[PDB]
Each structure stands twice: as C-alpha cells, then as structure tokens.
Design a protein around this nucleic acid. Structure first.
Lengths: 49, 89, 62, 103
RNA sequence: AAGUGAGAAUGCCGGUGUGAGUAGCGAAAGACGGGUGAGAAUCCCGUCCACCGAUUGACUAAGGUUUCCAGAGGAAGGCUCGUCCGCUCUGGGUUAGUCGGGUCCUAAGCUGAGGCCGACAGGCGUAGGCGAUGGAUAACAGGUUGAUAUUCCUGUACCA
RNA sequence: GAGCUGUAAGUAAGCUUUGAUCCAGAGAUUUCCGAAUGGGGAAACCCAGCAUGAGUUAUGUCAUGUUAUCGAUAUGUGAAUACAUAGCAUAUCAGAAGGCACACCCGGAGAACUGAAACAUCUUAGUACCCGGAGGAAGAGAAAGAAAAUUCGAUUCCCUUAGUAGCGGCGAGCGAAACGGGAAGAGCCCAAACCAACAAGCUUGCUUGUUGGGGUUGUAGGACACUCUAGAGUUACAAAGGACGACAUUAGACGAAUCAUCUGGAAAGAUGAAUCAAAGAAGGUAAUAAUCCUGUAGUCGAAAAUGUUGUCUCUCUUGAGUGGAUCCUGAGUACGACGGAGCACGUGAAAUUCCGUCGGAAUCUGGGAGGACCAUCUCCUAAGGCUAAAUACUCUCUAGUGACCGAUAGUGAACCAGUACCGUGAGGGAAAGGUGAAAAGCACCCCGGAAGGGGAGUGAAAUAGAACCUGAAACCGUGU
C-alpha cells in the first residue's frame, strides 16, 4: 500500500493512491465461515469454507 | 479511631453563652459525618447526646505582615446533650 | 520507648498513648504552656509500636 | 580543631595574646566566644522580653581562625594532629605533649 | 588577541523637564445647636427643611468570593478634608427529616460492548449509560443577638 | 566527636557520653485525584455490591481486601436451528496500556514563502509539522557482489580520488563510484533432503503435519554410499546461567613548620631572621598568608559497586576424504506488459532496486550478473530468519578546565519567575543584588499629637542610620 504522482501532458504532478482489488468471500480464517475482504491476487487457496 | 475525629474546642464569647443552654462546640475533621461525632462524644465523655449541628468554613485570604498566603479550612460541630455535664472549661 | 522490641501485644499501649495525646492536646487549647513538654514526643513513640506490629504482618504472613 | 573546654591564646585581635576559656561553640557561622575578650557593650532595644532592653556585657563571638590552642606540655601555640588505637581518636598536640582535655 | 571608539535609524530602556499653578475635580438642598479631639464646611447625636415616590422601595436567581461584626490606627489609599471608612492591624461570625440542590424519572443532545468505514490518527452506529431549564416527593404562629433564622429556642403538626 | 531542633532565625522548652542536629546503606507506612481500571462525574467528588472486624431492640456508620477491558494458559461455553458454528457467564494468567530528554535513531503521510532576477518542468525538500515503532544506541550486514588489473573479498565510519565522470527549460542547480591509506575486526542459526516415525476432549479456530535425528552451499555443497576419529571453548552473536579471585575507578584517612618589630581600629603589608616542599592550584580570616582555618600532592581505598574483566570449572562436542551415477538446494515466486516511485540520474537506449493491476517459467546439461538487446569469456548461486566492535546525541550525576559574562551582561529567572500582570481560550510574559569587621540598629535630655529633627552615646568613619559601598549628567534651590 503506497502513493505516487499523477502526471499530465505538460509534466505537472498531483497525488493519488493505488488501491488493491478487494472482494468478498464466505471463507475461513479463525473459525466460523465469514464474508471477508480478500483480493483477486490473494486467491491461491480454496473458496468455500 | 474515636480520638483523631476530635481536635480542639472553640472558646469564644458565643460558645460561653451556649454553655447555659448546654451546647458545646468542637472542631472535628473535614471528612467525618453527623453520626461519627455522636459515637465519639458518647464514649469519650460517656454522655447521651440529643442532636448535633455542623457547618463548613471556607479558607480566608492572608496578611501583609508576612507574604501572600492562605488559611486551612475548618469544620465546626455544635453537640447538645440533655442529661450530661461539661468535660472541658 | 527506645529499643524494646521484645513484645508481642502492644495495641493496648497504643490506646493508652492515644487517650494521653488527646488529653494533652485538649489543654494547650486553653493555655497550659508546656508546649515543649508537649506531645512532640508522645507522638514519636507510636510509630515505633506500629512498625513492628505491622512487620508482624509483612514477613510472617508472607 | 577545638571543642568546648580548653584554654587558648588569641593571636589576631586588638587584645593580642590573651588566654581564657571558651564557653559557646557556634559551628554555624565559624565563630568563637571567649571569656574576658571583646565585650561588645550590647545595647538592645527598649523591649519587655529582654528586661529594660539596653546595656549589658555578653562576650561577642570572634572568628575561629584568629584563635589557637596552646600546647599543654608547653603552653605555646600549636596545631592539632590525631592518632587513635581505640574506638574514637585522641588529639595529639603535634608538639609532643598529648591532650586529654576531651573534657 | 578582539563583543575596540556613538549625535541623528518617527532607534530600545530608565530618570527628569516645558505647556502650568493652566484643563479638570463625573446623579437629591441644605441650615444651625451640642459633643469629640493637637487639628472639624466634611465624623457623632438633635431639631427643622427637601428629594425618589411602578421607584435611588422589599424580596428570589445568576455572578463576585470575606467586602460582613467589634476594638485599635502611620502613613499609603479615597480626584479636597478626615478624629471617618467597602483601606491596614488583632480577634470573631454562616446550625435544616420537611428551605433550595444531590438522590427517582425522562427531552434536545453527548457518549456507546459486539458491528460497519478508513494510509495511521481516527470517523459513524444497536441495546445500554449520562443529561433540566420540565415530572414525582413532607411547616407553621411567636420569641429572641454587636453579627444566623421556616435552620437556634417555644408551642404544635406532617413524611419516611 | 559534643552537639541539638529545615532555607531563617530567634525564642519556648525539651532531647544526647547509653551515643543527639545530620554523611550514605536498607525496608515500612504512603490521605484524595491522575493510564485510573467496581459504577458515575463540572480531576482532587458522589453512589454501590461483597467474604471479615465494631455497636445498638435492631437498622444505620467505618475500617483492611476484592469487583475494568484486551492478551496468555490449564477451562467450561454453545437460543433460534438436530449438531458443532455465531452468544456466553462465574472463574484461572500478571504480558500489554501511560508518561517522559525529544536532542540522537527507524517507518507511514508530507507543504509553502524562496532560487531560476516573471513562471508551469526543476529548485527550496523528502526539509518544517502530524502519526506510529521505540532503543540506550538504532539502522545496515555474511555474495545469484564489485570489478581487468595480479581480481580479493560481510556491514558501517574518517581521509583521498573530486567538485572528477555524469544528469540538467543540457538553464538555476544537483553531483557519484571503483581505487588506495586508516579505525575496527568472528559469523551463524534454520528449512528441504531423508527417516526414528505421531500430537489435533465439543477447544483454544483445516489447510490435523503435528515430536525428533541429520544438515546449511558453489574447488557445486549436504543427503545416501567405498574411510573411521581429538580437540578448537561458554558467561560482547552461535542458546540461555553463577560460583573464583585481584586490580583501574566512585565516600570518608591522616594530611609538612613562623616568630619579632613598625604603622593601624585590626595586619597576611614593610623589615629581619628562620625553618617542610610526590603539596608555591584555589577560597576564608578586621588589609595582599606555601607554614592561622578550608583544602591541595600523596597515603587507607570504600561496611561496596561495577568498569579492563586478567582467571578455573559449568552446560558448551563429535568430526574427518571421496563418489559426484540420483536424492536435495525456499513458487503464483523468477520473468513480461501498463502506471508510478526511489537510486547522483528529469524514466532516457536504461541496466540495476520498490508498490498497484494483468499474464505467467523451466528447474545444476541448470539459474543469474558483468549501467542497450544478441555469441565469447569471466564470476556468483535468488525467491527463509539473527548478530559484537569501530559511529551519532545529552534532561541529568561526580570531578575538572577557559586571552568566557560580571546585575540594561550571563538563562525568560543571582532576589518574592514561568511569579505581579494581560486574554473567554490556545497563549504572552516583566521590574527588583551591595550598612559594618562585629547590631555594638542611636541608652538618656530638648521641641512636636506623631512623623522627624538638635545635643549626647556606639564606631576607624553617622555627609556608613536600613531612600544605608562609591554617587556622574539632565533638573531644582540659597548666598555672593
């Protein structure tokens, strides 16, 4: 998670953010199946738990 | 306890006139109630007291003689019996 | 009561001293100027009593 | 050093070289009061604690470096050294006659 | 070897001038007799006269925090005077079962365990908790002090 | 070592040759508030509920203690909805929280005035402030490295190379590295291979893999096999701990020896004669003291404490060639595209480092790197953790020093300082040292109600009298 610049054609710069692609899933971390915020590049394991 | 709740008695021209109506005034602590003084004067003097009246006193300023200072707050309590005698003078 | 640590029960000594102190303080109030023969040393006894009567709770009970 | 109960010769003063007896110690200001020496004719105020506060003769207290002991075995001025073999020390008169006027 | 030299920056701070014995001294109407004292147009008592008069009257609340009472003063203090004082110095003075509050209860709001949201800090919110300026709870006739009164005392009732 | 009762003194009396005022050691109690944590609350207040102690016909009142939310354990626990899963309450556990030197460190976010003689890229600058993590140091660190010269080797810090190479509206400006000379100097624990083989009360969470042994890396090394063997030393890393002394340092120790005259109110001065010296630094004393005090040179050190830790043990132990035929060697990671950032570098030919999104390898015939991409020739083994020394800063404590200040100076504060005072609040913030050697601080008489004078007295001095050392100008007066 971090920040950066948004640059125009004449090379000015304004701040922005890069946000991660978070989704919702009925999944497990600490017991009960819950609807939690995970990201599409964090689906390396199963889906329904 | 029943000894540290009683400091010194007040001896003025108003307390001397209250002796005829059987009403002794004492200087109690600033944390006791109107029931702890009834169980401290009925044991030290062993006398059945009737009623008890208390009043708070705010601190005063100071004096030019020394330097800018303050005074300690006091708590007066007028205990009146109806069969006992005096225990001071 | 300097250096008399050979005692178990002391509370009754305490109460004797406390009625002593109340009586003596209640007279200054009127007059009676022996204020250096006063209770600046009817008080310095009582802490001797209490310290031992309490270490008889700190070390024997834990 | 000096305690309370010796006799001494004063060397630096208007009355040079006079012996007497110290009475009051006064460590706090470093001063010495000596019998029959420097009667400041104390002339206090018309009080009513000090009776008819005014003239009287109490010995003014002079400085503790103008005064110096005198050797017991010789009654000449000395300094004071110290040895001990026992609990406290024993002041040795630094000129061979040792003083036991601890009293 | 240098914190090395002062007449000016509507320069900074302190002390003393000129304008000058000049401008001013900001609500009612006073007059005399007696008294006190080193000293009186100004303080104390007395008699007459006048002013406010839905108020310069009497009492609750907010606010201030011993200015309240007695005895003694060296000036400073008070827009003059002072033997006087809301000024200085000693020593004193405020009494509650029912009077106001606290305590019961809730309004607008303010905080809220789980619960959402957010770079962090931290925002928002459900039961709940707090929060009167409103609701529910029991006193009078009189006598007294240099200073307190439904509180102290006297008679008599009411609530728990 | 003979005195005592805070700075600040007197009194007013007591206390201490038994050991008083205090120089340190060490424990005890520690009212109420404050992270405040039994529940409230306008901090220093109010209302409880308990197992003990009190008393009264009881009731009432008070004193020890316990009653917070998160973590960590042995534990239950589980309505709807059978059954765990969400609730959950009585309990077990003493790890966290706040503050403060913010000076020095490490992250997250991140300005503008200003320079370019305007200004937008660029520069102020990753600076000020805000938030977190916090240590006595932190961060970095053990090669898929920098490098043609012979490559010689973990990281940081000072001196060079150098204002050089390079970057740049190729403007203002920004600005290396190899290299050599120094200070300082050790590296390891793990995974996997394998296998002896085994632990998930409803749980305290399915990705139960759960205990070993063995091993750690490039001359390509450990597994597993052809060979059989002892010391490297452990209380700065490898994993943690204390017996053992001696000594360098922090209180207190004893601490060398001067008389006489002169002037004076009093000499340390002048003068004359002496005498200690691992001490002739400095301050006090009625004037300028190496020999009158306080000390100082140096002697015990010190009922200790650690600092250099110099030292015995104690748990610290098993390693030694090869074979290289295969076993192993960290994956949505290596790498690629788009958008950005940090590197001296404006994103360029951009190599090399980070983040978001999308795609996505083969694996020791390997893989990668040599400031484009292809061959050669070198070199090194990625995708897991930890670490002393050399260095940066000072609220404070002890001992010192200065061609540093000397009361409009030096701290805002030498004394009544963050105080008088000023503001609804955040906040702003002064002025003020000096009698004498010793209060001997003017006994007494005269004028006045008193204040203040005039004599007298104390003193070396009273034009030294608390408007108290010296007393300059501006200004105000009287005589001539």
């Amino acid at each position: 998670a971090s920040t950066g610049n948004r640059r125009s054609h004449a090379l000015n710069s304004t701040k922005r953010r890069w946000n991660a692609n978070l989704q919702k899933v009925r999944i497990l971390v600490d017991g009960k199946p819950k609807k939690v915020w995970v990201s599409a590049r964090a689906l390396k394991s199963g889906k329904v738990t | 306890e029943a000894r540290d709740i009683l400091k010194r008695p007040v001896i003025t021209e108003k307390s001397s006139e209250a002796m005829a109506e059987d009403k002794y005034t004492f200087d109690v602590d600033t944390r006791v109630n109107k029931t702890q003084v009834k169980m401290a004067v009925e044991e030290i003097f062993n006398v059945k007291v009737a009623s008890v009246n208390i009043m708070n006193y705010k601190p005063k300023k100071k004096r030019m003689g020394r330097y800018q200072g303050y005074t300690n707050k006091r708590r007066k309590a007028i205990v009146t019996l109806k069969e006992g005698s005096i225990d001071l003078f | 009561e300097i250096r008399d640590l050979t005692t178990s029960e002391i509370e009754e000594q305490i109460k004797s001293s406390k009625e002593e102190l109340f009586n003596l303080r209640f007279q200054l109030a009127t007059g009676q100027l022996e204020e250096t023969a006063r209770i600046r040393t009817v008080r310095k006894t009582i802490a001797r009593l209490k310290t031992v009567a309490r270490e008889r709770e700190i070390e024997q009970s834990k | 050093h000096i305690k309370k109960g010796d006799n001494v010769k004063v060397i630096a003063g208007k009355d040079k070289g006079k012996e007497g007896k110290v009475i009051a110690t006064l460590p706090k200001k470093d001063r010495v009061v000596v019998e029959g020496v420097n009667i400041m004719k104390k002339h206090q105020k018309p009080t009513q604690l000090n009776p008819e506060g005014g003239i009287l003769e109490t010995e003014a207290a002079i400085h503790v470096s103008n005064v110096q002991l005198l050797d017991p075995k010789t009654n000449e001025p000395t300094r004071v050294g110290y040895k001990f073999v026992d609990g406290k020390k024993v002041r040795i008169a630094k000129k061979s006659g040792e003083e036991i006027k601890s009293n």
